[PDB]
Amino acid sequence: EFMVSLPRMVYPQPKVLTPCRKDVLVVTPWLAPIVWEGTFNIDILNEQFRLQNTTIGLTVFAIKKYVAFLKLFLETAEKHFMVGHRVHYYVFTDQPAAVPRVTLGTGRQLSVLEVGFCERRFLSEVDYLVCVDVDMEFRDHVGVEILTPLFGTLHPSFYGSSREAFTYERRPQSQAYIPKDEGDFYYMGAFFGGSVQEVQRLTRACHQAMMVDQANGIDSHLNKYLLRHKPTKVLSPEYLWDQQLLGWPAVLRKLRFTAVP
Ligand SMILES: [Hg+2]
Ligand SMILES: [Hg+2]
Ligand SMILES: [Hg+2]
Ligand SMILES: [Hg+2]
Numbered sequence: 001e002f003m004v005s006l007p008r009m010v011y012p013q014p015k016v017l018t019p020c021r022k023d024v025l026v027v028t029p030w031l032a033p034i035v036w037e038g039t040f041n042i043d044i045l046n047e048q049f050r051l052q053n054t055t056i057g058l059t060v061f062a063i064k065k066y067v068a069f070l071k072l073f074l075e076t077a078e079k080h081f082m083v084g085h086r087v088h089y090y091v092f093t094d095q096p097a098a099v100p101r102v103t104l105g106t107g108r109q110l111s112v113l114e115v116g117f118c119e120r121r122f123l124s125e126v127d128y129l130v131c132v133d134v135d136m137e138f139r140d141h142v143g144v145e146i147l148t149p150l151f152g153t154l155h156p157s158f159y160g161s162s163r164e165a166f167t168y169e170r171r172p173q174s175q176a177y178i179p180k181d182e183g184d185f186y187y188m189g190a191f192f193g194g195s196v197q198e199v200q201r202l203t204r205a206c207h208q209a210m211m212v213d214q215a216n217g218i219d220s221h222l223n224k225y226l227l228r229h230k231p232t233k234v235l236s237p238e239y240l241w242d243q244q245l246l247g248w249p250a251v252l253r254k255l256r257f258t259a260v261p
Contacts, residue, residue, distance in 0.1 A: 004051050011041055023251055028234060030185065032148075036236045037253040040145045044083065049144040055086040056147070057126035057196075060134040062093045063115070069135045069260060071100040078105055080138035080256070088126055122196045130193035132257070140256040146235055150194035150202070152187035152226045153235040155219070156246055161186065169220035175209035176220040178227060187226050188218045191240045191257065194232075202229075 020026055020211035025036050033039065059080065062070050070091065081087065089110040091099055096112050104110065122129060128147050157168060163183040169176035192198060206221040238252055 004046075006047050006051070009043065009047070011043060024224060024236070028230070032230065032232050032234055034234045034236060035145050035239070037097060037238060042141070042143060042145060045144045049085060049147065052127075054128070054144065055088060055126045056082045057088045057090055057122060057129045058082075059092065059129060059131050061115075062099075062134045063093075064094065065094060066134050067095050068099045071102060071168075072137050072260065074100070074102040074110070076138035078102070078108070080140060080143050081210040082144065084114050085096060085144065091145070106244065113128045116248075119200060122167060122200070125161050129190075129199040131199065133144050133190040135260050136190070137258055137260055138257050140238075140254040142256050146193070146233065146239070148194060148228070148233040150198040150231045150251050151192065151233040151235060152185070152222070152231045152238045153187045153191040154237050156237040157190035158186040159237050163240070166223075167219075168223050171218065174220070175212050176224045178224060183223075183227060184230070185226075185234060186229075187219070187223055187234075188240055189222045191235065192222065 009137050020039050021036055024034070024036055026036060026039050028034060029160075058075065058077065059071075062206050067217055074089065077087075077089070083105070085107075087108045089108070092108060092115050093099060093112060096114050099110075102110070130146070146182070163186075164180045166178075166186040167185055168178040168183060168186070170180075171177060194201070202222075202225055205225050209221050209224070236252075238254050238256045240257055241252070241255050243255060243261070244261050246256060
């Protein structure tokens with residue numbers, strides 16, 4: 001947590017009286033950045049994170065037919081995800097032998113964990129955990145701009161919607177319940193992350209709430225958690241897109257991580 005000085009760097013002076021983007025919200029009401037292209041200088045951020053020797057874990061579950069998505073997912077992650085930084089891929093799968101042999105860049109590693117003491121394993125191996133769906137591909141840069149204690153990503157189908165249209169859990173009997181007059185954003189579970197400690201907090205809360213609903217005979221739990229524990233960054237839909245369903249709107253300067261058609 002002691003941080004060394006940055007080196008001399010040459011880049012354009014930020015302009016106090018020029019908004020960064022005039023077409024989108026770039027900060028939430030609790031002062032968390034909303035990550036859009038144009039908001040960050042990746043050279044500055046790369047320096048800051050490299051100087052801390054940052055390691056990023058990327059976790060994916062690939063069960064049954066979803067193993068078929070791993071080759072493209074990992075090949076494209078190699079091109080676009082945290083390039084230059086230490087990356088540990090964690091692939092959770094029922095088919096260890098079906099994980100494709102993907103060639104990795106230096107400083108990058110992959111663990112296969114079979115699914116039908118180790119939570120501490122993430123704590124000792126990585127600084128940040130990023131949790132994504134495997135039936136996706138990277139098409140453009142996804143880097144250290146996303147890293148923060150806790151982040152969620154705007155659901156691409158709902159970023160322009162009013163909160164009453166959000167498909168939050170609406171049954172008051174559920175632990176996930178959000179009433180019509182509450183809600184900041186509609187976050188999608190396909191891309192979230194943060195420090196290991198904050199990600200483990202989130203998944204522990206979600207698991208307990210789901211068990212409680214289960215006992216009572218009942219994205220919703222994620223959305224409840226992030227309502228009540230505000231993320232320290234929010235990722236724009238550049239980070240979670242479906243071009244076939246939604247096209248390429250002008251508000252998206254890049255399409256970084258997308259559904260496979
Ligand atoms: Hg800017
Ligand atoms: Hg995770
Ligand atoms: Hg939750
Ligand atoms: Hg969750």
